[PDB]
């Protein structure tokens, strides 16, 4: 008998996830069905969504070789029914204070950066880039959270070697960017871009490095389309245009610049959406979305 949800204690809540107190050294990791656009949490979730990015992010920890925070298999007896396919049992890391972020194509911040400045995270770039342009190397672009609802804040190299020690600001640096670029390839391989990347580590018992919090899921990277790929034009979110699109057309009744809640979604948006998360997730894994675990 697996145990309630209710017999463990809630220690943090996200956007669309929600972490919880399993012993002194292990947590749960929940994904929901939750789904943010233009910042904002919308009405409608997204049909197997947390289920769907849990397989993703467990697909590409087995993928790279580096420790993770993974405790269990994603049937482990620890994991309640009820979110049995988008929770994980994981080991309780002391957390490093910085978003560890890969960029291999200018866009979002790290574009808008450019723009104002030539340089992004201490980075000074060639002249003559834009919008969806390819970086080669990738570029390590730190950030910081800041206040509730706030965006996280770009800092530069110095500013993490300020939280977390020479050595290791060296060694977040080096992880990330090699994690995001085996990654890259092997999506691009697959057809999908995966353009950036969001990463949090944490520290074990011994002082190691451990990959934590979820990789690689199109909440934590922009997913593109490679075979749409166009430098110079805003590339659609694989995930994500279909909702954005509906909700600042005609059809929405919702105006993006008063900045008021969004209205929900129409079902068939939310059924369409779902169905580009699972065409991702298959063609990423090589799997079926139709054998991964549920209640
Ligand atoms: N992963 C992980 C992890 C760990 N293995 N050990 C200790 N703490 C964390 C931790 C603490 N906060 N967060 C991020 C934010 N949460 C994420 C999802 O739930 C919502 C909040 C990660």
Known sequence: ?????????????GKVR????????????????????????LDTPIPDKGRILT????????????????????????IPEEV?????????????????????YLTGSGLLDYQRTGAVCGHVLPQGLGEASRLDPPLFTPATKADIGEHDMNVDFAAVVGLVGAVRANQL??????????????ALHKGIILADTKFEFGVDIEGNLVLADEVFTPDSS????????????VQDSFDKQF???????????????????????????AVATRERYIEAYERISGLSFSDWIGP
């Open 1 to 13: 008998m697996r145990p309630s949800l209710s017999d463990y204690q809630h220690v943090a809540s």
């Open 18 to 41: 929600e972490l919880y107190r399993v012993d002194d050294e292990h947590l749960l990791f929940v994904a929901t069905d939750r789904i943010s656009a233009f910042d904002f949490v």
């Open 55 to 78: 397989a993703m992010s467990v697909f590409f920890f087995g993928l790279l070789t580096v420790p993770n925070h993974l405790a269990g298999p994603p049937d482990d007896p620890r």
């Open 84 to 104: 049995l396919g988008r929770a994980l049992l994981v080991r309780r890391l002391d957390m490093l204070p910085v978003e560890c972020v890969a960029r291999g």
């Open 173 to 186: 640096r080096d992880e990330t960017i090699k994690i995001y670029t085996r990654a890259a390839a092997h």
């Open 222 to 233: 922009r997913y593109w389309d490679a075979a749409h790929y166009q430098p110079g034009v």
């Open 243 to 269: 909702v954005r699109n509906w909700l600042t057309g005609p059809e929405s009744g919702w105006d993006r610049a008063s900045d008021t809640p969004p209205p929900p979604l129409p079902d068939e948006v």
